[PDB]
Design a binder for this molecule. Structure first.
Ligand SMILES: NC(=O)c1ccc[n+]([C@@H]2O[C@H](COP(=O)([O-])OP(=O)(O)OC[C@H]3O[C@@H](n4cnc5c(N)ncnc54)[C@H](O)[C@@H]3O)[C@@H](O)[C@H]2O)c1
Ligand SMILES: NC(=O)c1ccc[n+]([C@@H]2O[C@H](COP(=O)([O-])OP(=O)(O)OC[C@H]3O[C@@H](n4cnc5c(N)ncnc54)[C@H](O)[C@@H]3O)[C@@H](O)[C@H]2O)c1
Ligand SMILES: NC(=O)c1ccc[n+]([C@@H]2O[C@H](COP(=O)([O-])OP(=O)(O)OC[C@H]3O[C@@H](n4cnc5c(N)ncnc54)[C@H](O)[C@@H]3O)[C@@H](O)[C@H]2O)c1
Ligand SMILES: *C(=O)C(=C)CCP(=O)(O)O
Ligand SMILES: *C(=O)C(=C)CCP(=O)(O)O
Ligand SMILES: *C(=O)C(=C)CCP(=O)(O)O
Lengths: 359, 359, 359, 359
């Protein structure tokens, strides 16, 4: 019994999540992506967008389009591995989405227009049973980070949840190892050298909610506030109020890195931390936290499925010698790729626990 | 008193058109910028946007703000060395703007939303007497290129006109010299290696009307159709149907280059052509057509106010020796700066003609 | 039966050629890269340079290192998928290389510092027999272009050949089709919007031989002269003195595009030419000349091993309607990748016309 | 009378120093560049590089060229705004330079190859009474940072000094105010988001002594160690062993920013720290340390001559609320412009103390 899934908003964020799901080999097997709602319904265009990608290369599977019924001008259905995905048109209120009629049980909310728990809940009225906001959320939606606290998902209590942000999914795994291994965190500050994104502008333009963010993205280092570090406190309560940080948007299309500076809760050493991080990578954090000890640069992390990738050499080479509390930890993350898989990983976990709850 | 002007759409062109005004010592004497309209009326933001430009440097003149009336919450007025500009709130429809209440006789239309003559005439209903669309128009609006056919402005017939595009303003001057000097243009094709603009995207995004135009701007050479070359047959009638061309959007925030290939109407040489352009540059095309014979690159043309800078060295070193018909002409232009000065020149020319006609 | 090859100058093209050779699965079966010579001998550093590529992704095969003999300090042997390559030291003079000791006949010259057929001939008196210059050659060295004139190879007359340039390899196939098809070419000028290369500078720097080429590469559009067009005349004598052109280095790491403007030797149509290029691609030019009809941009050609990919839409949409002589043809090419595969395709041709023609 | 100066190594930094020297209007009156020795003699080329800059705009002073004496073959003299500057040929040893013959007492060592105190000594044997190394130096050379410890310059003891690096000139002022204002530094880690430099490469190349540094510069976030932090321990001894940090080279041609994270020596608040830095920039750090409180990005610091420009908004908005020990401070710098002005400043300072010590 495959999972009936619907993706609300088939923008750049939605596609990656769908491509993620495909590469893992879940389409038509584990997950039945029934539909994808969006303001556009030209499947031929959606096929072109999946087929090519400036940063992630060419799609692994062939993509064809077709009509849902002979009585349709331009194709309105996506085809991948014989799996048919219907392209539905956007709706003002999520409650008006044909979710029930479509049989969609799990809807991936990625429009960025419904990050408020209450709003995202509309999908439920529209017939959905569970929603995953593919970004930070307000209103009190349960926030879950794979590999950190996803086992806290409660089928009967959590119907609208958030998979947090791509940056939190990079930082949290590092902090989670520190708090779980006993190094602990007294206070911390994080900085993320972040690739520019879709909200930024090519040339200087109007951006009322963030003036710096309206400046030419590919030719500027653009400072920015962020809530990713504070959010780690929701996934790991013991760090609430002890962490925060910023972001520097730099001229790269994809891939970012985490620069965490913190004071451990007890004497330790950078080598001791290096070992703990590596060890966790091969054990309880496998698939979520990985590491590298080669001379890598941002391009070498394009398409890496891990949420966080510890940079051993950079860490070990840039810490105070013989220091026991004040440390720096560098960890990479393909902001688009890692997160997209986490979103899929989370839907499968939820489905799994919802399933075992009806026995 | 000075010409009362209003700027609808304070973006790249609106602001650079303004810089041109201040720079040339026209503000308060020849031209009076009564107001500027954009998404908000928050002068502080307008000031910040004018004060700093990532490609054209810091505004050399001091900009401050004030309120039009204490009954106002936030400052809504810009002050540039004692000159006051009211920040009017954007209107979906031009006819709604308070041009009348402001005494605006000339309005620069630079939002990129009302390039249709019919839509632009909304400003006249608002109390404006003339309008210059800072882009190619449709609906039968007269098109004018300073240095080429601007003396075709008919005070009592043309009320809503178009100052063409940046590319046409770079091309036309060249073709005009070719036709006037008697070399002639039998057939021609041009390619413009163009800098990205506000219409493009930072990361692969949605662009139903121009699929290629939706791909990441600063990491792709993006082909694109353009009417710039065809529009020349609308300014230089004898070229109608003989020219056209394409564009290649590349990773630079500003400055572009026209690469024109053509067959002359008679036997010549690239040397004779070189001489003529240089000559016109120093004479009847001065101010509009300039030239360089140095090893310059795009950044070297940032802030050049001519409409076309003939690149002599590049032209002379890349043509068929002894050829007498098939030629290539390379010419640069600061797509933002040059064109913005042209808009101002156009308004001033219209204001003098208008006075003459009312004698 | 495994041949014998030796790459001199293991840089971008050297590694791209070696990688190309592996991609086609020739490492061991048909080709056997005996050894490679470059700057240092740090086998560890070579492998790292092979594992990761900023634009071409991560290498397909697994790479590791060992020692040719315990007698040597650091490693000096690559173990790509099993094969064993030796990192012989590089000499300032090609003659000083021990190609005889290792017995290497076919030596890929990719250092980019030995163009003269005399200097790049030292490989012969150094032990090697046949030498291939991965770049335009001088001193009268036979120039060959797969799909165009590579059959003009004389086993006993040609011992130091050239594979031409990336650009020549992209332009030639188009010209070839045009000529061979009967359209013919009276005159033609070509412009290539080209990505920056290793010879350029990250920031404005010294470059006596080419001032423009000395300016900041990733932020400027830089003009340059090129021989590519004239070079075609050497490969298709029918066009000698009929073609020339220039380049424009733009802010992209790889992938370029040719923009050819020409007058046919007879009356035709852009449609009749479009059809022939497509036909030639599927037939006698397959593998050398490809084509697309989708909304592609530079990034979409990354890793395309065709020498020239004709852009049907960019072409059919940008030519003069009803024209029959003056035309514009657009064709792409991964300057690093395509040329690399051609180098292998050539080295293999220079072998099949030896073991089947004299053995 | 005017300070007779010489600039060994007229590379980019050598040029920036000269332009800065001119920008301060010191050329001819308060300092005269007798000559500028470099590996190249092509004065015309010198005039070209000085005339245009892809990031700093066009030179505000006219530069022409002539011969020192009709007997001289090519032009060997640069004529700047009137002042005459000779282009001497480079030597293998400073002592071989005509410094004394020319009457050059202060030589600006910026060839980057005479870093060693002993090496840089040769200039003294040649006649020069003082040498300033425009970069970190070794061999027991006095390191001086304007506004921080330049008053530690000993006329008769320090004849060969270092002006440190761009980064140290940004961090030092910040730390200096922290220490001088009574906050103190217990421990500190610094991260600099740094724009690429001349030693990096356009495409993946060879960097035997820095694998990451060899990767494509304008398309990667490239990690890197740095001495700036530790180097501060020379200027401000109390911090020795307390500070260290790294670097992240990003896709920008110029302008960088320091991200400092530290623990104060006493309890404070970010407000208190913020107020102090501002007060200091307005007083004893005037000209060296500046601050901003506007929404600025990298482009806005281009041509800023301060050594460090504190970012108040970014600092205040990104620190732990109510924190009293663990803080983060953000400060910008035009790694090319600021440092170039400091160099000039150091020479002017020395020249001053040297004379007052013998009056
Ligand atoms: N930038 C160039 O190189 C260039 C050169 C020549 C001509 N043009 C033309 O100028 C026009 C504007 O181009 P741009 O580069 O300045 O783009 P831009 O996006 O920078 O400027 C457009 C501005 O209009 C504002 N706006 C949007 N809707 C509005 C409304 N209803 N009322 C008032 N303001 C509104 C936007 O906030 C924006 O600031 C376009 O038509 C373009 O084709 C651009
Ligand atoms: N990359 C391209 O776009 C391209 C495409 C086709 C042909 N080519 C031609 O290939 C040649 C090299 O181009 P590239 O892009 O690979 O440049 P590159 O700089 O990346 O490669 C050249 C390599 O040779 C090494 N080298 C220098 N002197 C050497 C010596 N004496 N012995 C051994 N190695 C030495 C350099 O360290 C460098 O790694 C040039 O002739 C170029 O015209 C380049
Ligand atoms: N560019 C910056 O951001 C910057 C800022 C501050 C300090 N520095 C320091 O400056 C030095 C390099 O300056 P750059 O970054 O401007 O590099 P650059 O490559 O632009 O300058 C090097 C110049 O030195 C010339 N040169 C080399 N050896 C020479 C010799 N023997 N005689 C004469 N000329 C010679 C070269 O021709 C070249 O023009 C390094 O020590 C660097 O740490 C650089
Ligand atoms: C000049 O830059 C132009 C008018 C290009 C078209 P647009 O994208 O509208 O700026
Ligand atoms: C291939 O040969 C290239 C690296 C392009 C050289 P050019 O045609 O001069 O841009
Ligand atoms: C300032 O940018 C530095 C710390 C030195 C730059 P470079 O020596 O070119 O790496």
């Amino acid at each position: 019994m495959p999972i009936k899934v619907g993706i609300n908003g088939f923008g750049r964020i939605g596609r990656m999540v769908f491509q993620a799901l495909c590469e893992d080999g879940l389409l038509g097997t584990e997950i039945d992506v029934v539909a994808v709602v969006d303001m556009n319904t030209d499947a031929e265009y959606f096929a072109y967008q999946m087929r090519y990608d400036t940063v992630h290369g060419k799609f692994k599977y062939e993509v064809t389009t077709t009509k849902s019924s002979p009585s349709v001008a331009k194709d309105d259905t996506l085809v991948v591995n014989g799996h048919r995905i219907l392209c539905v048109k956007a709706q003002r209120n999520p409650a008006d989405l044909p979710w029930g009629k479509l049989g969609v049980e799990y809807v991936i909310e990625s429009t960025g227009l419904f990050t408020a728990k209450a709003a995202a809940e509309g999908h439920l009225r529209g017939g959905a049973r569970k929603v995953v906001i593919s970004a930070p959320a307000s209103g009190g939606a349960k926030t879950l980070v794979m590999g950190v606290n996803h086992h806290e998902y409660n089928p009967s209590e959590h119907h609208v949840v958030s998979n947090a942000s791509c940056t939190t999914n990079c930082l949290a795994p590092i902090v989670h190892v520190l708090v779980k291994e006993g190094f602990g965190v007294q206070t911390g500050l994080m900085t993320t050298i972040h690739s520019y994104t879709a909200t930024q502008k090519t040339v200087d333009g109007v951006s009322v909610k963030d003036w710096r963010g309206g400046r030419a993205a590919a030719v500027n280092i653009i400072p920015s506030t962020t809530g990713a570090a504070k959010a780690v406190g929701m996934v790991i309560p013991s760090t609430q109020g002890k962490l925060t940080g910023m972001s520097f948007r730099v001229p790269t299309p994809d891939v970012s890195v985490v620069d965490l500076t913190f004071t451990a809760a007890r004497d330790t050493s950078i080598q001791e931390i290096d070992a703990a991080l590596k060890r966790a990578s091969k054990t309880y954090m496998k698939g979520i936290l990985g590491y590298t000890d080669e001379e890598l640069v941002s391009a070498d992390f394009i398409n890496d499925n891990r949420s966080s990738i510890y940079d051993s050499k950079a860490t070990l080479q840039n810490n105070l010698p013989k220091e026991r509390r004040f440390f720096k930890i560098v960890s990479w993350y393909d902001n688009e790729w890692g997160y997209s898989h986490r979103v899929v990983d989370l839907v499968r976990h939820m489905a799994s626990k919802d399933r075992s709850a009806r026995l």
